[PDB]
Amino acid sequence: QSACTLQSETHPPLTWQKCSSGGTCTQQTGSVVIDANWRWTHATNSSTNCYDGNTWSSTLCPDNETCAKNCCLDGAAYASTYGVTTSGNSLSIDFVTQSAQKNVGARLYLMASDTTYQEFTLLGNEFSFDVDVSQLPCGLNGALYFVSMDADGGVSKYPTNTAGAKYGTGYCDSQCPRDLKFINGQANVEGWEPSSNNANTGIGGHGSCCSEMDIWEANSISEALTPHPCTTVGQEICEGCGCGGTYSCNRYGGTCDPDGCDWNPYRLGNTSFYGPGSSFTLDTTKKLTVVTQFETSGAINRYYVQNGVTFQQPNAELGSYSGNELNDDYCTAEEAEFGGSSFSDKGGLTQFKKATSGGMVLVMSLWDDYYANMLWLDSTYPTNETSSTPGAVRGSCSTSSGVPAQVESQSPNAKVTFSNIKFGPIGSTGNPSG
Ligand SMILES: *[C@@H]1O[C@H](CO)[C@@H](O)[C@H](O)[C@H]1NC(C)=O
Ligand SMILES: [Co+2]
Ligand SMILES: [Co+2]
């Protein structure tokens, strides 16, 4: 797709700290850009939509190539249309924003320049950030994570994509998403099937795969840390059901691990660690600091800070595993006790280490779940299971919670705020910011 300018594109600025082993941190200046799927896609020489509702223009987009040639992505009014705002080192994303039309959430990427994404090499370093999830009820997911995307959004590999990172192209994750309207410089109209429960989305014949490090997926009820390896580390297109993931006719069999080795304190047994109010170790009605360290062994460590008090990830005992470090033993024990073989089939932490050793793009989003109502994060899932089933309960939310239309109608003002991002060598982000 190309880029049009009927609507100007001004990326909300966002600063962050780059810390060094020497003990000091220096401020960096970047910005955020919204993913291409949220944009208006229209004809290059007119205002005629190439995509509207959940279907494509049969005339402008008869096939993927013709569609990309005839269509362009336009600018985004971040605050008025998407409910996205920033202030210094803080970023806020509203849930439902009403303008001429209704918008739900957003997916944003941190940029290095107005035309390139900021790449981070996680291995050997740690990532710290503050978050306010107080306004996130059951069914919502305020997420901060990393994916192995190209810094240019795919332009160098696919010249038919001239919009690039400036317009949020090139997304990919461990679900090998097929809902993307443009992949590899081509539209995804071929094989497109409108969503049965979402008037704005659909699934196409192509998907976009790549490694995914879900540092933070949570709401005021539950939170999870989850590495997702793929046999091909970076962004790579996939065909139909062979894509795997939630969309496909079979979530497995693809090149990526859609499940991942997840660590949810509640799911592991400590139901008093994270929640709303003073009855929990971490009070989700108040802002908290989340630090994630990627040691060179490939294992992941985590600690939290709230009101000046530090808490390491709570210990968990599963099978023969005992500890609070997300390592090979934990992941293998999880599969043995909770079931599944996706994470290990895709190479586990050894394969994932290939992703963190390379560059990954920072993603921050807010979304509700049109496939599983976010029950996998904050409720009992599958819903027919009980606490007697290992790992079935992940949160205190009712198994009836999270219906998109309902939470969108009831909690339109929900929101998430990410702030004070700090990145640097392990043990360095706690020092004074620049
Ligand atoms: C949960 O984790 C916190 C922090 O590690 C700990 O202080 C508390 O005792 C744990 N509670 C339970 C029930 O495991
Ligand atoms: Co194809
Ligand atoms: Co970890």
Q: How far apart are CA 383 and CA 234, in angstroms?
A: 34
Catalytic residue flag (residue 334): no
Q: How far apart are CA 42 and CA 63, in angstroms?
A: 15
Q: How far apart are CA 237 and CA 206, in angstroms?
A: 7
Ligand 1 center from residue 273 Cα (angstroms): 6
Ligand 2 center from residue 235 Cα (angstroms): 15
Contacts of residue 369, defined as CB under 8 A and 6 or more positions apart, other chains included, come to 139, 141, 375, 402, 404
- Give the CA-trace dihedral at 29, 182, 262, 134, to 10 degrees: 60
Q: How far apart are CA 273 and CA 328, in angstroms?
A: 24
Instruction: Considering only CA atoms, give the Rg of the chain.
Output: 21
Header resolution in angstroms: 1.6
Q: Count Cβ atoms below 10 Å from residue 38 Cβ, excluding itself.
A: 19
Give the closest residue to 11 by CA, choosing from 118, 97, 102.
Answer: 118
Lookup result for tokens 């996706």 = 342
Catalytic residue flag (residue 295): no
- Structure-block tokens of residue 275: 């929640």
Around 292, how many Cα atoms within 13 Å sit in the side-chain half-sphere? 23
Q: How far apart are CA 199 and CA 125, in angstroms?
A: 41
Q: Which atom of ligand 1 is nearest to the CA of 315?
A: 5
Q: Which atom of ligand 1 is nearest to the CA of 314?
A: 5
Q: Is 306 in the pocket of ligand 1 (CB under 6 A)?
A: no
Ligand 3 center from residue 213 Cα (angstroms): 10
Q: Are 145 and 216 in contact (CB under 8 A)?
A: yes
Q: How far apart are CA 43 and CA 215, in angstroms?
A: 38
Approach to solving: X-ray
Extract long-range pairs of 388-392: CB within 8 Å, 24+ residues apart.
390/337, 390/338, 390/339, 391/267, 391/334, 391/337, 391/338, 391/339
Length reported for the chain: 434
CB burial of 353-390 (b: ≥16 within 10 Å; e: otherwise) equals bbbbbbbbbbbbbbbbbbeebbbbbbbbbeeeeeeeee
- Residue owning the nearest CA to atom 13 of ligand 1: 270
Q: What is the DSSP string of 283-311?
A: ETTS-EEEEEEE-TTS-EEEEEEETTEEE
Lookup result for tokens 């500890």 = 323
Q: How far apart are CA 175 and CA 197, in angstroms?
A: 19
Please state the domain extents for the chain.
2-434
Please give the helix or strand (H or E) that residue 331 lies within, else none.
helix 328-338
Please give the helix or strand (H or E) that residue 377 lies within, else none.
helix 375-378
Around 383, how many Cα atoms within 13 Å sit in the side-chain half-sphere? 10
Q: Taking the alpha carbons of 252, 254, 257, 259 in that order, is the dihedral positive or negative? A: negative
> Residue 173 forms beta bridges with which residues?
209
Q: How far apart are CA 60 and CA 49, in angstroms?
A: 9
- Structure-block tokens of residue 319: 């099978």
Lookup result for tokens 């709570």 = 314
Give the closest residue to 416 by CA, choosing from 363, 373, 359.
Answer: 363
Mutational pocket test of ligand 1: of 223, 272, 393, the residue with most ligand atoms within 8 Å of the beta carbon: 272
Q: From residue 74, give the alpha-carbon distance in Å to each of 8, 40, 182, 310.
A: 8, 6, 14, 45
Q: How far apart are CA 253 and CA 280, in angstroms?
A: 40
Q: How far apart are CA 361 and CA 383, in angstroms?
A: 34
Ligand 3 center from residue 310 Cα (angstroms): 16
Superfamily of domain 2-434: Glycoside hydrolase, family 7, domain (2.70.100.10)
Mutational pocket test of ligand 1: of 222, 263, 267, 270, the residue with most ligand atoms within 8 Å of the beta carbon: 270
Pairing state between β 415-425 and 90-94: antiparallel
